[PDB]
């Protein structure tokens with residue numbers, strides 16, 4: 299159940315939060331983690347769950363720890379420990395200075411520039427899917443939109459056949475939210491097995507997909523190795539199949555239950571980008587961490603070299619010390635403060651692709667299906683993990699209230 303409290307961890311700082319099955323899941327995953335920001339929970343606690351680790355509960359500490367890579371290394375960023383030890387993805391598993399040369403290469407295959415290209419391809423698919431769904435008056439949002447819209451765009455960017463989705467998506471999820479049929483190590487090895495012949499094939503005969511660009515690129519001037527390309531592409535694949543997919547679902551679940559929120563977007567489409575940020579904060583969903591490089595006193599707490607500390611990017615924006623009424627969605631919110639795309643030298647390279655997907659989704663869905671609700675009676679279930687998400691989201695609406703556009 300719980301790991302024996304290490305001698306150096308204060309008994310009064312213990313708070314056994316379980317990141318893969320938080321107590322409050324029924325109330326909502328963001329709410330379940332929010333329990334860590336309650337009146338008498340300190341800024342830093344120790345949970346004996348998942349092997350034992352620190353958890354920074356407030357954005358101030360979260361931001362600081364992410365900026366201080368000397369003490370909090372990305373070397374072992376995943377929890378549980380075994381998983382963090384096998385996590386060798388590039389460039390997320392490296393700290394500056396060595397990280398940059400690779401981060402630059404990755405920025406080349408998913409950055410703004412690549413996204414402006416993809417713009418029309420992304421609108422076409424969003425419309426394509428929504429219009430095909432419009433007349434039915436119902437859908438399984440997670441499988442009929444949330445998953446194929448972002449994944450197909452990534453599989454297109456990566457130059458990979460769509461039939462590979464079921465397999466890759468299953469591996470990916472075992473890494474963020476393991477159902478237990480596979481360890482992080484097994485999921486990664488299969489992802490590395492998938493790529494290897496594809497990376498060797500595109501190095502032998504260069505194309506113009508994100509994969510070829512990576513296997514054939516350079517780092518600070520020198521040629522990338524096969525193995526280095528593999529570690530980077532696995533990360534890219536990981537960032538493309540399980541982030542926006544889940545986020546679209548928290549956003550649309552909320553919109554289906556907020557008629558007033560929907561109207562505002564119908565009435566004033568010019569605020570969709572702003573709503574996109576507010577939702578990015580409200581339904582933040584990533585939580586990874588770092589490992590202590592040496593013994594280090596942090597905010598009055600003694601951390602030992604080797605201790606893992608989970609720094610929930612999700613919690614910053616939900617922190618009342620960052621945004622008043624944090625649990626409240628307000629598209630007109632003055633200063634939207636958050637760390638949903640991370641913080642420090644590891645800032646999300648895919649955020650520009652993420653915002654673009656989210657915004658076109660908001661624009662095109664509302665423009666064709668302005669009124670919809672959650673299937674009557676449905677009991678929505680979230681799952682918590684490195685990346686939290688929605689199990690299923692049944693949606694219904696009346697086709698008479700829609701419009702081809």
Ligand code: HEM
Nearest residue numbers: 389390537538541542584611638639640644646647648652
């Ligand atoms: C709503 C969507 C997304 C969210 C909230 C998100 C969140 C994050 C977070 C929190 C990190 C930092 C991890 C750390 O510091 O350990 C990160 C890194 C990264 N993400 Fe995103 N991500 C999203 C979408 C994407 C997409 C679509 C891609 C590309 C296909 C992507 C690619 C990356 C990469 C390559 C990194 C690594 C940066 C580095 O390690 O320097 N992400 N992301």
Ligand SMILES: CC1=CC[C@@H]2C[C@H]1C2(C)C
Nearest residue numbers: 390533536537541586685
């Ligand atoms: C967007 C992402 C790609 C890979 C893992 C999931 C995040 C990360 C925590 C860095």
Ligand SMILES: [K+]
Nearest residue numbers: 373382383385
């Ligand atoms: K590692």
